[PDB]
Amino acid sequence: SMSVKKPKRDDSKDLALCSMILTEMETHEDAWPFLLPVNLKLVPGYKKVIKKPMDFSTIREKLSSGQYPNLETFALDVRLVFDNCETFNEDDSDIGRAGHNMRKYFEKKWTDTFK
């Protein structure tokens, strides 16, 4: 509350560390469905169904231009990528499986780096 603060968690490396995580996700062999924004002209249903599209290139540009206020808003957009993927793709599809694999990979790196 006013003039009563918990001890200061060191967040000075968060930007560098989120960038490293994102590099690892970018270079994963199963990243290919997520590297670029879904083409809303060429994929029927996407625009109407997926209210907030997100992809790794969009996260990278947001990261690089100070559009994440803290490490939690960064994790929310990464998870959005995988939540969108599960909304639109069957579990038993190459893309559906890719999304599960990547979400697992992410959540481990997240825990090991920050928890």
Swiss-Prot record:
Bromo domain: residues covered: 9-113
Localization terms from the record: Nucleus
Tissues and organs where the protein is expressed, per its UniProt entry: Expressed at varying levels in several tissues, whereas a smaller transcript was expressed specifically in testis.
Complex formation: Component of the BRF-1 ISWI chromatin remodeling complex, at least composed of SMARCA1 and BAZ2B, which regulates the spacing of histone octamers on the DNA template to facilitate access to DNA. Within the BRF-1 ISWI chromatin remodeling complex interacts with SMARCA1; the interaction is direct. Component of the BRF-5 ISWI chromatin remodeling complex, at least composed of SMARCA5/SNF2H and BAZ2B, which regulates the spacing of histone octamers on the DNA template to facilitate access to DNA.
Similarity annotation: Belongs to the WAL family.
Function as written in the Swiss-Prot or TrEMBL entry: Regulatory subunit of the ATP-dependent BRF-1 and BRF-5 ISWI chromatin remodeling complexes, which form ordered nucleosome arrays on chromatin and facilitate access to DNA during DNA-templated processes such as DNA replication, transcription, and repair. Both complexes regulate the spacing of nucleosomes along the chromatin and have the ability to slide mononucleosomes to the center of a DNA template. The BRF-1 ISWI chromatin remodeling complex has a lower ATP hydrolysis rate than the BRF-5 ISWI chromatin remodeling complex.
Protein known as: Bromodomain adjacent to zinc finger domain protein 2B
